[PDB]
Design a protein around this ligand. Structure first.
Ligand SMILES: [Fe+3]
Length: 312
C-alpha cells in the first residue's frame, strides 16, 4: 500500500509530516515537491498515465487553475466535509484547505508613519507617494489579493483602489516576497505587501543573519478584516491509490496534520492560529469571509485590471 504525492508546497519542509503518516498507517508515501504550475502542466500532459494520487497546491489562483484543468475528482469523506471550514474547501468537494496564510502590509516605521496604516485602502494615501513597493503581478499571491478586493467591492471600486496604489509605487516590481521584505527592512521601500510567513522565516534565522537583521526593522500590519489564502489538497482525477490518498488528505487536514504542515512554514493551521511565538506576536486576525472558491472565480478579472492599471 502506497500513495504518490505531487506537492506545490515548495518550501522543502514537509517530509517529516509524511513520515509521521507512514509510521502511523504503514502506507508508504512517495512525495515529489516542486513548483505547483510545473505539477499542473505535468499532470495535463500525463493524464491517465500519471502516477499522482494526491496533489497539494499553494494559493487559490493555482487551485482554480488545477480545478479548470479537471485535475481533481470529487471525494466522499465524513471527516473532511464535517471538519474543514466551508470557506476553505471546494463546495463540489474536489479540494480541501490544509494551511492558512495572510497577505499583509509590512512597513519601515523610520520611513512612513505606521499610525496612518490599518488596511489595504490606506496604501492609496498620497503621503506614501514613492514609498510603496510591490511584488509583480505574475505572483498568484497578488492576483488572489486583487481577486479578494473584487469579491467584496466589485470591479469598479477595486480599479479605483488599484490606480491609487500603483500611483504610490516608484520602484520596479519585485520578483519575490523575501526580496521585498529586505527592501522594506533596508528602508529603500517604506511599505510592502507580502505573505506573513516569509517575515516569520526571516525573523527565525532560516535565511541567515542579514535577513533576520532586516526583518527586525519591519512593522507587520494585519488588515482588519484579513485576507486569508490557503494551501489545499485534492485527489487526482485518475488516482490509482484513491483510498490511500483520501486517508492521507484526512490526516493532513486533521489538527495534527495541519499543525505539522503549518509549523514547518510558519503558516496558521486550518482551524486554530499558530502556537509559534514569532507568528503570535504579529497579532490576532479576523478573516473577511471571502471564500477560496471566490478568489479563484475572479482571478482572470484581477489579472486583466492589474494589467490595465500597470501593475507589472
Ligand atoms: Fe509562498
Amino acid at each position: 500500500k502506497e500513495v504518490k504525492v505531487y506537492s506545490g508546497r515548495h518550501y522543502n519542509t514537509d517530509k517529516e509530516v509524511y513520515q509521521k503518516f507512514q509510521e502511523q498507517t504503514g502506507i508508504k508515501v512517495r512525495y515529489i515537491e516542486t513548483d505547483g504550475k510545473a505539477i499542473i502542466e505535468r499532470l495535463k500532459r500525463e493524464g491517465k498515465n500519471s502516477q499522482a494520487d494526491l496533489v497539494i497546491l499553494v494559493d487559490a489562483a493555482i487551485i482554480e487553475n488545477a480545478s479548470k484543468a479537471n485535475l481533481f475528482q470529487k471525494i466522499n469523506s465524513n471527516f473532511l466535509e464535517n471538519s474543514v471550514p466551508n470557506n476553505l474547501r471546494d463546495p463540489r468537494n474536489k479540494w480541501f484547505g490544509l494551511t492558512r496564510r495572510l497577505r499583509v502590509i509590512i512597513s519601515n516605521p523610520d520611513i512612513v508613519d505606521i499610525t496612518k496604516i490599518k488596511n489595504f485602502e490606506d496604501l492609496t494615501n498620497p503621503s506614501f507617494k514613492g514609498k510603496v513597493c510591490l511584488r509583480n503581478r505574475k505572483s498568484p499571491y497578488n492576483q488572489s489579493l486583487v481577486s479578494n478586493q473584487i469579491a467584496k467591492k466589485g470591479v469598479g471600486q477595486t480599479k479605483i483602489w488599484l490606480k491609487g496604489l500603483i500611483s504610490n509605487v516608484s520602484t520596479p516590481y519585485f520578483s519575490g516576497d523575501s526580496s521585498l521584505i529586505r527592501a522594506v527592512g533596508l528602508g529603500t521601500c517604506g511599505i510592502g505587501i507580502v505573505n506573513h510567513y516569509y517575515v516569520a522565516r526571516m525573523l527565525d534565522g532560516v535565511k541567515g543573519p542579514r535577513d533576520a537583521s532586516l526583518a527586525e526593522k519591519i512593522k507587520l500590519i494585519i488588515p482588519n478584516p484579513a485576507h486569508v489564502n490557503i494551501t489545499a489538497g485534492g485527489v487526482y482525477k485518475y488516482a490509482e491509490n484513491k483510498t490511500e490518498a483520501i486517508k492521507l488528505l484526512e490526516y493532513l487536514a486533521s489538527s495534527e496534520g495541519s499543525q505539522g504542515l503549518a509549523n514547518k512554514t510558519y503558516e496558521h493551521p486550518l482551524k486554530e492560529s499558530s502556537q509559534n511565538r514569532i507568528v503570535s506576536k504579529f497579532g490576532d486576525f479576523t478573516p473577511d469571509n471571502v471564500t477560496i472558491k471566490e478568489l479563484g472565480k475572479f482571478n482572470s478579472k484581477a489579472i486583466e485590471i492589474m494589467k490595465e492599471v500597470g501593475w507589472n
